[PDB]
Design an enzyme around this catalytic site. Sequence first.
Site, PDB file in Angstrom:
ATOM      1  N   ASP A 196       0.872  -1.102  -0.042  1.00  0.00           N
ATOM      2  CA  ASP A 196      -0.153  -0.096   0.068  1.00  0.00           C
ATOM      3  C   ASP A 196       1.006   1.074  -0.069  1.00  0.00           C
ATOM      4  O   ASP A 196       2.003   1.069   0.412  1.00  0.00           O
ATOM      5  CB  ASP A 196      -0.832  -0.032   1.323  1.00  0.00           C
ATOM      6  CG  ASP A 196      -2.045   0.806   1.205  1.00  0.00           C
ATOM      7  OD1 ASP A 196      -2.532   1.120   0.042  1.00  0.00           O
ATOM      8  OD2 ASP A 196      -2.632   0.762   2.402  1.00  0.00           O
ATOM      9  N   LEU A 197       0.476   2.298  -0.385  1.00  0.00           N
ATOM     10  CA  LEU A 197       1.497   3.481  -0.289  1.00  0.00           C
ATOM     11  C   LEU A 197       1.594   4.315   0.815  1.00  0.00           C
ATOM     12  O   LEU A 197       2.521   4.573   1.549  1.00  0.00           O
ATOM     13  CB  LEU A 197       1.102   4.406  -1.730  1.00  0.00           C
ATOM     14  CG  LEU A 197       2.374   5.121  -2.085  1.00  0.00           C
ATOM     15  CD1 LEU A 197       3.591   4.277  -2.283  1.00  0.00           C
ATOM     16  CD2 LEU A 197       1.988   5.814  -3.309  1.00  0.00           C
ATOM     17  N   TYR A 198       0.442   5.143   1.097  1.00  0.00           N
ATOM     18  CA  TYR A 198       0.325   6.217   2.113  1.00  0.00           C
ATOM     19  C   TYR A 198       0.038   5.681   3.448  1.00  0.00           C
ATOM     20  O   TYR A 198      -1.104   4.865   3.718  1.00  0.00           O
ATOM     21  CB  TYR A 198      -0.683   7.257   1.748  1.00  0.00           C
ATOM     22  CG  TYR A 198      -0.285   7.892   0.401  1.00  0.00           C
ATOM     23  CD1 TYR A 198       0.779   8.193  -0.017  1.00  0.00           C
ATOM     24  CD2 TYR A 198      -1.536   8.212  -0.566  1.00  0.00           C
ATOM     25  CE1 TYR A 198       0.858   8.703  -1.392  1.00  0.00           C
ATOM     26  CE2 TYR A 198      -1.659   8.737  -1.719  1.00  0.00           C
ATOM     27  CZ  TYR A 198      -0.232   9.018  -2.131  1.00  0.00           C
ATOM     28  OH  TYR A 198       0.068   9.451  -3.411  1.00  0.00           O
TER      29      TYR A 198
END
Lengths: 220, 220
Positions: free
Chosen positions: A8-10
């Site tokens: 996942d990124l953030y």
Amino acid sequence: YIKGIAFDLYGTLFDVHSVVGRCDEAFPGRGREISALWRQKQLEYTWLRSLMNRYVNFQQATEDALRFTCRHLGLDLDARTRSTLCDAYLRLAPFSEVPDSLRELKRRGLKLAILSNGSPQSIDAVVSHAGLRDGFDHLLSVDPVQVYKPDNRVYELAEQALGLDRSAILFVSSNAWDATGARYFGFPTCWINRTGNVFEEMGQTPDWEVTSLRAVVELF
Amino acid sequence: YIKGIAFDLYGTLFDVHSVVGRCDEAFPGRGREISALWRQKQLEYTWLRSLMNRYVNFQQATEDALRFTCRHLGLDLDARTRSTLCDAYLRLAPFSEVPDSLRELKRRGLKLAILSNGSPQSIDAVVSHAGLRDGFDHLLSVDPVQVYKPDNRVYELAEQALGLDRSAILFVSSNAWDATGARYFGFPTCWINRTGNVFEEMGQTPDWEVTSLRAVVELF
């Protein structure tokens, strides 16, 4: 056995707290309010548009979410300031343990990938700016399927791009609602919970709940 | 011409402020917090379960949303107290202008219906307790379609039950996200905005934005 990892990124790799400051500089004293509501609207809009079958890319969805946020707060948002705040997402700093942890997992021979909402170009930008680019095999966007998570068609994409079956792809995310979606789909799930939050009550529980990526390495 | 009207329940006809008080009695001083988060989780869970294709009736969704809320706040929720707070929704009071407005619209010969999330039995209970039962032709629940709004399959249901085409059914709602869904579907939309909120930024605008049901009568 897990042969690959979908990130996942953030909140999982990159700290978004940076955006809060950049918001406060634009509207002094309001930063925490703006960023708080802006993030929720971003979520809601991706979900709501998916249910209505009315997709638009994440960039548009981010601008709309900001426009509503300011209008709701009584703040006047001009084009110039709107672009600046939006550019703030392309210049995030990773969590301290991230770099080393990614290097170590790649040492262990696992295929690493990122599945986010934004364009592939922007995803690339974030990781390149953070000098982490070389550690990822695949940079994926939901754009190709014209829908957002937790629609199962986004998860298949991660499964297809990695050339592995879901049971061999660890799904790592800081969002409990996303970990629930992944969990239902079939992915072994790892919830990244740093600030002591609780899991969502939608019938699921992650296979592992950890406080950072450091713990992720120990699993292998 | 509009030959029928599809109504929303909470915020459109019935005031939910009642639940806030009942929450504060259970957990003194926390009422506003509990009810605020509880309502958002109810929304999120209906949306998220719809996207994941994992339906459960609204009653379950309401309990889950409360369970998470208390767990997130550090509050201890026993079964007894959980039922009480949940029963609070079956004893709401309508907005002052509601009764007269419904009587007047029925005088004008319009077919009136309610489309909500809960079971038909509970929807009936709310309107009966408020002595408004006799004013509605159809009491509809999303249960038959095993999905929630804004999934278009819920809107068709309202269209099918009323025996009218969408362009002849006024969709009345206090939720901007729902008015957006309805608007995309084809229903002429009337947004009930009492407390001066702004419309969502998902590409839509209601045909009419009013401050109460009094104004709805004037349109006919």
